[PDB]
Amino acid sequence: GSMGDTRPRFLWQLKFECHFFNGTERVRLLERCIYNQEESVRFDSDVGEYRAVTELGRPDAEYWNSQKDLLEQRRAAVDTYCRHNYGVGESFTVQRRVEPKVTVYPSKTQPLQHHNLLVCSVSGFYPGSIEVRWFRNGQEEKAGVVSTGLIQNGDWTFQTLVMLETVPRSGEVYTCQVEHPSVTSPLTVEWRA
Amino acid sequence: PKYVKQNTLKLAT
Amino acid sequence: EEHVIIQAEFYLNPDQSGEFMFDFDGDEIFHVDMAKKETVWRLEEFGRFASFEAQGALANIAVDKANLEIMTKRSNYTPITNVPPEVTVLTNSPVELREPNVLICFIDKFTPPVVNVTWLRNGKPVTTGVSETVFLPREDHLFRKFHYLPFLPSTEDVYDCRVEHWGLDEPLLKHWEFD
């Protein structure tokens, strides 16, 4: 065991999820009650009443569905809760755009003789939607590309790293190109062979 | 601009 | 486009630990500090753009606590099954000697939301300037958490993030060294 106090634990979680499609043109509210790791009951605005998910949630669905004022408030919450909160934060969440910092360098490991392993690091950006590609002269490279995938840093930024094994030749230029919603022209950083 | 929360309901007893 | 806002709360016994937070597309907007009874914004500027009355979170948590006691009895005292975390260490950006950077310890896919995280520098605990997030939600109803350590990179220093959790037999140690 890696820590003490092994008494049994009991966990209760509530999640109220507001799902938005095309701005606020379509909104779905999903309320979920979860005991330990098991969802027991939910309110789905597309259904319009509480439903038990497991046997443990049946008494709650029955009780809550018998309260008319409760159901009316819940059915109106896509307006009074979801669309309201969407509006509160839109300018600094939905509209947040932070430009990536892009650097290129050769890896400290050069695992193959006569080859050059190049690294493109893309950091500090928001939102997560991004494309990071390598080009050789004017041609996009699709063999020997390795992407670490998208990493969320926990602080409203992301990073990613994309590596290319190359056989550099005279007159070749390698470019890391980044497409991201914060810029209207792609960012590019070149390594000259 | 104020965030609004959903109230948590009492379970059946 | 698609976006999701989640109000996520929990209560855990016997720890008497509660949490209340809002999440946007997987990032925390704010949480309520239960001891200080105050709204804590994830980025400081958010508090100049928006507000949240922290007493509402406290009222919710009191109901959550009462409901946990109901569910504990209704389930015939069925406790949670521990699920240990997966741990990753990375830096905020490529590291350069003597240019300040930040080590990130990402703790993922675990429950219950109790975890002990220690940064070690050359095998010794470091606390200078560390910070951490609260427990963040996942769609499988497990949790995520981040711990941060600012540092001045050196060729002489090595780092480890040590993670302990009721689901782990031995502590997990994840290493970072200047390349």
Short mmCIF file of C-alpha atoms in Angstrom, two decimals:
data_model
loop_
_atom_site.label_atom_id
_atom_site.label_comp_id
_atom_site.label_asym_id
_atom_site.label_seq_id
_atom_site.Cartn_x
_atom_site.Cartn_y
_atom_site.Cartn_z
CA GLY A 1 0.00 0.00 0.00
CA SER A 2 1.42 3.44 -0.75
CA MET A 3 -0.54 5.47 1.88
CA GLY A 4 -2.19 4.79 5.21
CA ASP A 5 -5.75 5.11 6.48
CA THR A 6 -7.32 2.33 4.43
CA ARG A 7 -10.85 2.84 5.83
CA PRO A 8 -13.62 2.32 3.23
CA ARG A 9 -14.59 5.43 1.29
CA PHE A 10 -18.02 6.50 -0.02
CA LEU A 11 -18.26 9.11 -2.81
CA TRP A 12 -21.22 11.12 -4.15
CA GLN A 13 -20.84 13.28 -7.27
CA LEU A 14 -23.27 15.57 -9.11
CA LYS A 15 -22.64 16.82 -12.63
CA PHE A 16 -24.76 19.37 -14.43
CA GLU A 17 -23.65 19.37 -18.10
CA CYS A 18 -24.67 22.04 -20.58
CA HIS A 19 -24.01 20.93 -24.19
CA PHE A 20 -23.98 23.68 -26.85
CA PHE A 21 -24.33 23.25 -30.63
CA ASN A 22 -23.83 26.15 -33.08
CA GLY A 23 -23.40 28.83 -30.46
CA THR A 24 -26.55 28.45 -28.34
CA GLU A 25 -28.83 27.48 -31.24
CA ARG A 26 -29.17 23.99 -29.76
CA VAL A 27 -28.70 23.27 -26.03
CA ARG A 28 -28.96 20.01 -24.09
CA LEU A 29 -28.86 19.84 -20.26
CA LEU A 30 -27.80 16.53 -18.69
CA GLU A 31 -27.85 16.26 -14.87
CA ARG A 32 -26.19 13.16 -13.43
CA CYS A 33 -26.05 11.74 -9.89
CA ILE A 34 -23.16 9.32 -9.36
CA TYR A 35 -22.53 7.10 -6.35
CA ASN A 36 -18.93 5.77 -6.13
CA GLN A 37 -18.33 5.19 -9.79
CA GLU A 38 -21.88 4.37 -10.89
CA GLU A 39 -24.36 6.88 -12.29
CA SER A 40 -27.69 6.19 -10.56
CA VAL A 41 -30.19 8.76 -11.94
CA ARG A 42 -30.24 11.52 -14.54
CA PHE A 43 -32.28 14.40 -15.95
CA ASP A 44 -31.89 14.73 -19.72
CA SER A 45 -33.61 17.81 -21.21
CA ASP A 46 -34.21 15.88 -24.42
CA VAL A 47 -36.32 13.43 -22.34
CA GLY A 48 -37.88 15.97 -19.98
CA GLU A 49 -38.12 13.92 -16.75
CA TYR A 50 -35.76 12.11 -14.43
CA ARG A 51 -34.86 8.54 -15.28
CA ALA A 52 -33.15 5.90 -13.17
CA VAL A 53 -29.92 4.61 -14.67
CA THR A 54 -29.45 1.81 -12.12
CA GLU A 55 -31.68 0.22 -9.53
CA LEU A 56 -30.23 2.49 -6.78
CA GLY A 57 -31.70 5.58 -8.46
CA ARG A 58 -35.32 4.40 -8.81
CA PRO A 59 -36.65 6.02 -5.57
CA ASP A 60 -35.24 9.41 -6.60
CA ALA A 61 -36.63 9.45 -10.12
CA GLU A 62 -40.07 8.57 -8.73
CA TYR A 63 -39.93 11.22 -6.03
CA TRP A 64 -38.57 14.03 -8.16
CA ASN A 65 -40.92 13.36 -11.06
CA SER A 66 -43.86 13.82 -8.65
CA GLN A 67 -42.88 17.47 -7.95
CA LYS A 68 -44.39 19.60 -10.69
CA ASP A 69 -42.60 22.84 -9.84
CA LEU A 70 -39.27 21.02 -9.81
CA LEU A 71 -39.87 19.56 -13.28
CA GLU A 72 -40.88 22.96 -14.61
CA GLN A 73 -37.68 24.52 -13.30
CA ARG A 74 -35.56 21.76 -14.72
CA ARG A 75 -37.21 21.94 -18.15
CA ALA A 76 -36.56 25.72 -18.25
CA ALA A 77 -32.93 25.39 -17.16
CA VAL A 78 -31.63 25.21 -20.75
CA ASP A 79 -32.56 28.90 -20.77
CA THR A 80 -32.13 30.08 -17.15
CA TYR A 81 -28.93 28.07 -16.52
CA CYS A 82 -27.17 26.85 -19.68
CA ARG A 83 -27.78 29.80 -21.98
CA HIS A 84 -27.29 32.23 -19.07
CA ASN A 85 -23.86 30.85 -18.08
CA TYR A 86 -22.82 30.56 -21.71
CA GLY A 87 -23.34 34.30 -21.98
CA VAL A 88 -21.47 35.11 -18.76
CA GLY A 89 -18.26 33.54 -19.91
CA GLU A 90 -18.37 33.71 -23.73
CA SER A 91 -15.88 36.55 -24.19
CA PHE A 92 -13.04 34.85 -22.25
CA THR A 93 -13.79 31.16 -22.95
CA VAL A 94 -15.47 30.62 -26.36
CA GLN A 95 -13.55 33.61 -27.78
CA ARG A 96 -10.21 32.79 -26.13
CA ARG A 97 -7.42 32.56 -28.72
CA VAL A 98 -3.76 32.26 -27.68
CA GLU A 99 -1.10 31.93 -30.40
CA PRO A 100 1.34 28.96 -30.22
CA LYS A 101 5.05 29.41 -29.64
CA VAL A 102 6.82 27.32 -32.31
CA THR A 103 10.43 26.15 -32.08
CA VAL A 104 12.44 23.70 -34.17
CA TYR A 105 15.61 21.93 -33.10
CA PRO A 106 17.49 18.68 -33.78
CA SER A 107 16.86 15.96 -31.19
CA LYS A 108 19.70 15.31 -28.78
CA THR A 109 19.32 11.66 -29.75
CA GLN A 110 20.42 10.93 -33.29
CA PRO A 111 19.50 7.24 -33.35
CA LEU A 112 20.40 6.69 -37.02
CA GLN A 113 23.67 7.58 -38.72
CA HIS A 114 23.42 9.78 -41.86
CA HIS A 115 19.96 10.91 -40.67
CA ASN A 116 18.80 13.97 -38.71
CA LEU A 117 15.89 13.62 -36.29
CA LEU A 118 14.12 17.05 -36.17
CA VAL A 119 11.72 18.24 -33.46
CA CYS A 120 8.95 20.81 -33.82
CA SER A 121 7.63 22.00 -30.46
CA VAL A 122 4.36 23.88 -30.37
CA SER A 123 3.42 25.27 -26.96
CA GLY A 124 1.26 27.66 -25.00
CA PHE A 125 -1.74 27.71 -27.34
CA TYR A 126 -5.57 27.81 -26.96
CA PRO A 127 -7.97 26.32 -28.02
CA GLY A 128 -6.82 22.72 -28.54
CA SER A 129 -7.76 22.46 -32.23
CA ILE A 130 -4.44 22.55 -34.15
CA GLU A 131 -2.61 21.02 -37.06
CA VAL A 132 1.22 20.65 -37.00
CA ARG A 133 2.86 19.42 -40.22
CA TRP A 134 6.35 19.04 -41.65
CA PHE A 135 7.26 20.09 -45.19
CA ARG A 136 10.32 19.22 -47.26
CA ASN A 137 10.74 22.10 -49.76
CA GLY A 138 7.18 22.55 -50.99
CA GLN A 139 5.96 19.00 -50.24
CA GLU A 140 4.13 17.91 -47.10
CA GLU A 141 5.94 14.96 -45.44
CA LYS A 142 3.86 11.92 -44.49
CA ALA A 143 6.37 9.15 -43.88
CA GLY A 144 8.46 9.11 -40.72
CA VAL A 145 6.39 11.70 -38.90
CA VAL A 146 5.67 11.06 -35.24
CA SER A 147 3.25 13.21 -33.23
CA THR A 148 3.02 13.18 -29.43
CA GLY A 149 -0.59 14.27 -29.73
CA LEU A 150 -2.36 17.05 -27.93
CA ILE A 151 -1.44 17.64 -24.29
CA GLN A 152 -3.68 19.81 -22.05
CA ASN A 153 -1.48 21.66 -19.46
CA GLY A 154 -4.33 22.34 -16.96
CA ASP A 155 -3.92 26.16 -17.20
CA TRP A 156 -5.89 26.98 -20.31
CA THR A 157 -3.02 26.17 -22.66
CA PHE A 158 -2.02 23.14 -24.70
CA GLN A 159 1.19 21.85 -26.25
CA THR A 160 2.26 19.27 -28.79
CA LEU A 161 5.46 17.99 -30.36
CA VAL A 162 6.00 16.55 -33.86
CA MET A 163 9.24 14.80 -34.92
CA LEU A 164 10.58 13.97 -38.41
CA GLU A 165 13.43 11.56 -39.37
CA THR A 166 15.24 13.22 -42.31
CA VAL A 167 18.15 12.49 -44.68
CA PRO A 168 19.21 16.10 -45.27
CA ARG A 169 20.61 16.98 -48.72
CA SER A 170 21.99 20.25 -50.15
CA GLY A 171 19.27 22.61 -51.29
CA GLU A 172 16.64 21.05 -49.06
CA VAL A 173 14.62 23.18 -46.64
CA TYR A 174 12.50 21.63 -43.88
CA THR A 175 9.61 23.67 -42.47
CA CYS A 176 7.34 23.07 -39.46
CA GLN A 177 3.94 24.58 -40.35
CA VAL A 178 1.17 25.26 -37.80
CA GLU A 179 -2.53 25.88 -38.47
CA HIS A 180 -4.47 27.20 -35.48
CA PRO A 181 -7.58 29.44 -35.01
CA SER A 182 -5.47 32.22 -33.45
CA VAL A 183 -3.80 33.05 -36.80
CA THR A 184 -5.19 33.63 -40.27
CA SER A 185 -1.92 32.63 -42.03
CA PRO A 186 -0.07 29.51 -40.86
CA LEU A 187 2.94 29.94 -38.59
CA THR A 188 6.14 28.50 -40.10
CA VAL A 189 9.60 27.79 -38.69
CA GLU A 190 12.33 26.61 -40.99
CA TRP A 191 15.38 24.36 -40.55
CA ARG A 192 17.85 24.77 -43.47
CA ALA A 193 19.86 21.61 -44.32
CA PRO B 1 -22.24 38.95 -15.08
CA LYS B 2 -22.91 36.26 -12.51
CA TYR B 3 -22.68 32.51 -12.85
CA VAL B 4 -25.85 30.73 -11.64
CA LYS B 5 -25.71 27.26 -10.16
CA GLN B 6 -28.25 24.45 -10.37
CA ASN B 7 -29.55 23.58 -6.87
CA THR B 8 -28.95 20.06 -5.57
CA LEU B 9 -32.13 18.20 -4.60
CA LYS B 10 -32.69 16.04 -1.52
CA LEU B 11 -32.81 12.29 -2.31
CA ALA B 12 -35.88 10.23 -1.41
CA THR B 13 -36.07 8.75 2.08
CA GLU C 1 -19.32 24.71 -32.92
CA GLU C 2 -19.50 22.36 -29.85
CA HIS C 3 -18.80 23.37 -26.25
CA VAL C 4 -19.67 21.88 -22.86
CA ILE C 5 -19.95 23.63 -19.48
CA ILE C 6 -20.04 21.35 -16.41
CA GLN C 7 -20.90 22.21 -12.82
CA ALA C 8 -19.25 19.33 -10.94
CA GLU C 9 -19.48 18.74 -7.21
CA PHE C 10 -18.66 15.90 -4.87
CA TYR C 11 -18.65 14.91 -1.25
CA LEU C 12 -16.42 12.14 0.18
CA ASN C 13 -16.66 10.29 3.55
CA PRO C 14 -15.07 9.62 5.96
CA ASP C 15 -12.77 12.43 4.85
CA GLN C 16 -15.59 15.04 5.02
CA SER C 17 -14.11 16.44 1.81
CA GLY C 18 -16.30 18.49 -0.55
CA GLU C 19 -15.66 20.15 -3.89
CA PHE C 20 -17.56 22.50 -6.21
CA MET C 21 -16.19 23.65 -9.60
CA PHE C 22 -17.18 24.74 -13.12
CA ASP C 23 -15.39 23.31 -16.19
CA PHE C 24 -15.39 24.58 -19.81
CA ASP C 25 -14.19 22.11 -22.50
CA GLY C 26 -12.02 20.33 -19.89
CA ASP C 27 -10.46 23.43 -18.25
CA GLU C 28 -11.45 24.72 -14.84
CA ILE C 29 -13.21 28.12 -14.78
CA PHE C 30 -13.34 28.37 -10.97
CA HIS C 31 -13.81 26.35 -7.83
CA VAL C 32 -14.99 27.27 -4.35
CA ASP C 33 -12.44 26.99 -1.51
CA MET C 34 -14.43 25.21 1.20
CA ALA C 35 -12.24 26.41 4.06
CA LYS C 36 -12.11 30.08 3.05
CA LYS C 37 -15.69 29.96 1.63
CA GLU C 38 -14.56 31.92 -1.41
CA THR C 39 -14.60 31.68 -5.20
CA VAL C 40 -11.14 30.95 -6.62
CA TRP C 41 -10.68 31.70 -10.35
CA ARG C 42 -8.38 29.43 -12.36
CA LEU C 43 -6.84 32.41 -14.20
CA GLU C 44 -6.87 35.55 -12.11
CA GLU C 45 -8.38 37.79 -14.84
CA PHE C 46 -11.57 35.70 -14.91
CA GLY C 47 -12.56 37.32 -11.62
CA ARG C 48 -12.58 40.71 -13.19
CA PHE C 49 -14.97 39.54 -15.91
CA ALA C 50 -17.44 37.42 -13.96
CA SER C 51 -18.60 36.61 -10.43
CA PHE C 52 -19.95 33.61 -8.52
CA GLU C 53 -21.60 33.76 -5.07
CA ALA C 54 -19.66 31.17 -3.06
CA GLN C 55 -22.41 30.71 -0.44
CA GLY C 56 -24.49 28.91 -3.11
CA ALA C 57 -21.76 26.29 -3.48
CA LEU C 58 -21.68 25.80 0.32
CA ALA C 59 -25.45 25.27 0.43
CA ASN C 60 -25.16 22.64 -2.33
CA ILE C 61 -22.35 20.86 -0.52
CA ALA C 62 -24.41 20.58 2.66
CA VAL C 63 -27.16 18.85 0.67
CA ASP C 64 -24.53 16.65 -1.07
CA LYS C 65 -23.23 15.55 2.36
CA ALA C 66 -26.72 14.64 3.60
CA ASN C 67 -27.40 12.75 0.33
CA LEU C 68 -24.11 10.84 0.58
CA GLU C 69 -25.22 9.55 3.98
CA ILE C 70 -28.58 8.45 2.46
CA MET C 71 -26.83 6.65 -0.46
CA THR C 72 -24.27 5.02 1.83
CA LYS C 73 -27.06 3.40 3.82
CA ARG C 74 -29.25 2.69 0.76
CA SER C 75 -26.39 0.76 -0.93
CA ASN C 76 -25.96 -1.41 2.21
CA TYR C 77 -22.66 0.41 2.93
CA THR C 78 -21.02 -0.44 -0.41
CA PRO C 79 -17.67 1.42 -0.54
CA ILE C 80 -15.90 2.72 -3.59
CA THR C 81 -13.41 0.50 -5.45
CA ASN C 82 -10.00 2.23 -5.66
CA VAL C 83 -8.75 2.98 -9.18
CA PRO C 84 -5.08 4.02 -9.18
CA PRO C 85 -3.81 6.91 -11.29
CA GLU C 86 -1.67 7.08 -14.42
CA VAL C 87 1.03 9.69 -13.99
CA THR C 88 2.96 11.73 -16.64
CA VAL C 89 5.68 14.38 -16.16
CA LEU C 90 6.46 17.00 -18.75
CA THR C 91 7.65 20.61 -18.91
CA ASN C 92 5.65 23.66 -20.06
CA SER C 93 7.96 24.14 -23.05
CA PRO C 94 11.37 22.95 -24.28
CA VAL C 95 13.87 23.63 -21.54
CA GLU C 96 16.93 25.88 -21.88
CA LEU C 97 19.73 26.06 -19.29
CA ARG C 98 19.20 28.91 -16.83
CA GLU C 99 15.86 29.95 -18.44
CA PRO C 100 12.98 29.52 -15.94
CA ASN C 101 10.47 26.79 -16.84
CA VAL C 102 7.76 24.71 -15.15
CA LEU C 103 7.51 20.97 -14.47
CA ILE C 104 4.02 19.50 -14.73
CA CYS C 105 2.89 16.30 -13.00
CA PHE C 106 -0.34 15.09 -14.60
CA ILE C 107 -2.26 12.58 -12.46
CA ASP C 108 -5.13 10.98 -14.41
CA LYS C 109 -7.88 8.34 -14.31
CA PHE C 110 -8.21 7.72 -10.56
CA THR C 111 -10.74 7.59 -7.76
CA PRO C 112 -11.54 8.36 -4.93
CA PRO C 113 -10.31 11.97 -5.17
CA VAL C 114 -7.56 11.71 -2.59
CA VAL C 115 -3.94 11.61 -3.82
CA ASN C 116 -0.57 12.53 -2.37
CA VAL C 117 1.97 14.17 -4.73
CA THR C 118 5.58 15.04 -3.79
CA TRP C 119 8.19 16.69 -6.02
CA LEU C 120 11.76 15.42 -5.40
CA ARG C 121 14.89 17.23 -6.57
CA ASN C 122 17.94 14.96 -6.51
CA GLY C 123 15.85 12.63 -4.35
CA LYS C 124 14.88 15.33 -1.75
CA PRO C 125 11.41 16.87 -1.33
CA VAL C 126 11.00 20.35 -2.89
CA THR C 127 8.17 22.68 -1.98
CA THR C 128 9.46 26.04 -3.25
CA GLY C 129 6.69 27.66 -5.24
CA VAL C 130 4.69 24.49 -5.99
CA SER C 131 1.01 24.77 -6.90
CA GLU C 132 -1.77 22.37 -7.74
CA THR C 133 -5.25 22.19 -9.15
CA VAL C 134 -8.36 20.76 -7.47
CA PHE C 135 -9.75 17.36 -8.64
CA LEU C 136 -11.03 17.76 -12.18
CA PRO C 137 -13.89 15.59 -13.60
CA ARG C 138 -13.73 12.93 -16.35
CA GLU C 139 -16.60 11.42 -18.38
CA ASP C 140 -15.94 7.98 -16.83
CA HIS C 141 -16.49 9.66 -13.40
CA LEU C 142 -12.83 9.29 -12.46
CA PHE C 143 -10.66 12.36 -11.71
CA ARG C 144 -7.68 14.34 -13.09
CA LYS C 145 -5.27 16.65 -11.25
CA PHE C 146 -2.17 18.76 -12.08
CA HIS C 147 0.78 19.70 -9.85
CA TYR C 148 3.28 22.35 -10.93
CA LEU C 149 6.88 23.16 -9.95
CA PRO C 150 8.69 26.25 -11.30
CA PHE C 151 12.37 25.63 -11.71
CA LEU C 152 15.68 26.88 -13.07
CA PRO C 153 17.04 24.18 -15.40
CA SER C 154 20.50 22.79 -14.69
CA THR C 155 22.60 19.90 -15.88
CA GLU C 156 23.20 18.94 -12.21
CA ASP C 157 19.56 18.56 -11.07
CA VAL C 158 17.25 15.62 -11.58
CA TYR C 159 13.54 15.58 -10.68
CA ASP C 160 10.83 13.05 -9.81
CA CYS C 161 7.09 13.30 -9.15
CA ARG C 162 6.13 10.74 -6.44
CA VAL C 163 2.41 9.81 -6.41
CA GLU C 164 0.62 7.81 -3.68
CA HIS C 165 -3.00 6.61 -3.80
CA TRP C 166 -5.04 3.86 -2.06
CA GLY C 167 -5.12 1.95 -5.31
CA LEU C 168 -1.32 1.71 -5.63
CA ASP C 169 0.72 -0.97 -3.81
CA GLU C 170 3.93 1.11 -4.14
CA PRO C 171 4.38 4.77 -4.91
CA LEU C 172 4.70 5.74 -8.52
CA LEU C 173 7.85 7.71 -9.38
CA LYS C 174 8.03 9.54 -12.73
CA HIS C 175 11.40 11.05 -13.69
CA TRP C 176 12.58 14.17 -15.55
CA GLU C 177 16.17 15.18 -16.46
CA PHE C 178 17.56 17.86 -18.76
CA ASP C 179 18.21 16.31 -22.17
#
